[PDB]
Amino acid sequence: GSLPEARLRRVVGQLDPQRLWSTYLRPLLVVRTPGSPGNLQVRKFLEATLRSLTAGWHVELDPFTASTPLGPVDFGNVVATLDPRAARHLTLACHYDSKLFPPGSTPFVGATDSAVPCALLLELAQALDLELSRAKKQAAPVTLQLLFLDGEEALKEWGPKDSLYGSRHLAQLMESIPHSPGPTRIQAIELFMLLDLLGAPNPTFYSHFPRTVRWFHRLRSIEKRLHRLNLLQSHPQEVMYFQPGEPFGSVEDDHIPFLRRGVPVLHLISTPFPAVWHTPADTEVNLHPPTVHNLCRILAVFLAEYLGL
Ligand SMILES: COc1ccc(NC(=S)NCCCn2ccnc2)cc1OC
Ligand SMILES: [Zn+2]
C-alpha cells in the first residue's frame, strides 16, 4: 500500500522543518551524559513534549541504577506508547544520552549521535498527530511506540558490559511484563527500527537483517519516489541513501538486546559513520540540514504507509 501522490504531498506538507530544528533539535544539543543534570533536563523535555501531543500517548519512564566504571549511575529510558490497548506496535528507537568525554576539550553534544534521531521521532509524532489520534480512536490493531534510550554509550570503553545500559535494561523489563496476546511486551514489538548516526551529509544505509529486508526495500522505494517527485534536496541521483547489497559489517547498538530476544530489527544507521563521529565536531554546524529534512520526509512516508495513516 503506497500513498496516492496527492496524499503523499499532503503528508510531506505536514512536516515543519523549523519546528524540527528549533523546537525539537536545538534544545537537545547539550551535554547529556548519564546521571548529569543535562541528561535529566533532556529526559524531562522529551517526556513533557510527548505528553503534550493531542493523540494522548502513554508516556512512562524506566528508571534504574546500574554499576558502571564511574560507580553507580542512574539511567532512565523514556517509553512512549500511543495506544497501550493495542496488541502490537511499530517501535522506533534512538538513544538520548551523549557519550562522556573527560574535561578539557570542547564539550561533546553528539548532534548526529543521536540528537538528530531524537528530533526526527518528535517531529514525526507531531506532524502525524492528527492521523495518529484518529487511528487510536478507531482502536487500530498496530500502534506506534517511541523509545528514547539512556546510556547507549560506553562510560569509559565500549564492550558487552560498558554500553547499552538502557536498552539491556528495557528489553529485560519488557520480557518480564505480560501483554495480550503477547505473552510478554517483547512480542508486542512487530518491528524495531533503530535510528542512529543521522544528520551528516551523504549517509549510506545497508540492510543489516535479511529478516526485515522488505522494509529496507520500502525505504529505498520511498527515496526513489520522493527524488522523482522533486521533493528531495541535494539529491542528484535516484538512489543515494539506501544502498543495495551487503553491509560492510554489523554495528553493536541498542537493538542487540531486542534482537537476541527474537524481535525483528531494522538498523537505520549510516555506515560509514559520519566523519565527525565521537569527536567534539559532531555539532549543529556540521549537520547537513537538507539531508536531515530528506530523511524526515522518507520516514514520514514510511510511517504513514506502515500504519495506514
Ligand atoms: C568509525 O567507524 C566504526 C567504528 C566502530 C565500529 N564498530 C562498532 S561495533 N561500533 C559500535 C558503535 C556504537 N555506537 C553507535 C553510536 N555511537 C556508538 C564500526 C565503525 O564503522 C562501521
Ligand atoms: Zn556514539
- Closest ligand to Cα 275: 1
Whether the ω angle into residue 234 lies within 30 degrees of 0, i.e. cis, is no
- Among candidate residues 83, 79, 92, 75, the one with its CA nearest the CA of residue 32: 75
Method: X-ray
- C-alpha 99 to ligand 2 mean position (Å): 6
CA 303/CA 131 separation, integer angstroms = 11
- Closest ligand to Cα 205: 1
Compute CA distances 201 → 121, 197, 290, 301, whole Å. Answer: 19, 11, 9, 21
Residue 287 cell numbers, joined = 549537520
153 is in an annotated binding site: yes
DSSP 116-143: HHHHHHHHHHHHTHHHHHHHHHTT-SEE
- C-alpha 280 to ligand 2 mean position (Å): 11
Instruction: Give nearest CA residue, ligand 1 atom 7.
Output: 251
Determine contact, residues 57/89, Cβ cutoff 8 Å.
Answer: no
Please tell me which residue in 152, 190, 253, 282 is annotated as part of the active site.
152
- Reply yes or no on whether 152 is catalytic: yes
CA 28/CA 113 separation, integer angstroms = 11
Determine contact, residues 299/120, Cβ cutoff 8 Å.
Answer: yes
DSSP the chain: -PPPHHHHHHHHHH--HHIIIIIIIGGG-S---TTSHHHHHHHHHHHHHHHHSTT--EEEEEEEEE--BTB-EEEEEEEEES-TTSSEEEEEEEE-------SSSSPP--IIIIIHHHHHHHHHHHHTHHHHHHHHHTT-SEEEEEEEES--S-SSS-BTTBS-HHHHHHHHHHHHSB-SSSSBTTTTEEEEEEEES-SSSS--B----GGGHHHHHHHHHHHHHHHHTT--SS--SS-SSB--S--S-----TTHHHHTTT--EEEEE-SSPPTTTTSTT-SGGGS-HHHHHHHHHHHHHHHHHHHT-
- C-alpha 252 to ligand 1 mean position (Å): 7
What resolution (Å)? 1.4
CA 24/CA 203 separation, integer angstroms = 21
- C-alpha 277 to ligand 2 mean position (Å): 7
CA 270/CA 205 separation, integer angstroms = 5
CA 123/CA 52 separation, integer angstroms = 13
Complete domains list, the chain, with CATH: 1-309 (3.40.630.10)
Please give the distance of CA 178 from its chain centroid, rounded to a whole number.
Answer: 25
Please tell me which residue in 83, 123, 196, 253 is annotated as part of the active site.
196
- Closest ligand to Cα 94: 1
Max alpha carbon distance in the chain (Å)? 55
Give buried/exposed letters for 144-156 (b at 16+ CB in 10 A, else e).
Answer: bbbbbbbbbbbbe
- Best mutation site among 32, 165, 248, 273 for ligand 1 pocket (most ligand atoms within 8 Å of CB): 273
- What's the burial of 197, exposed, middle or buried (CB within 10 Å: 0-12/13-18/19+)? buried
Cα atoms found within 13 Å of the Cα of residue 168, Cβ hemisphere only: 16
Which amino acids bring their CB within 6 angstroms of ligand 1? Answer: 113, 153, 196-197, 249, 251-253, 271-273, 277
Residue 241 cell numbers, joined = 541513501
Residue 16 cell numbers, joined = 515543519
**Residues in the chain, how many?**
309
As beta bridge partners, residue 76 has 63
Residue 238 cell numbers, joined = 535516484
Whether the ω angle into residue 183 lies within 30 degrees of 0, i.e. cis, is yes
The residue written with cell numbers 538502557 in the block is 166
For the beta carbon of residue 162, count every other beta carbon within 10 angstroms: 17
Q: Which one-letter amino acid corresponds to residue 264?
A: P
The residue written with cell numbers 574535561 in the block is 103
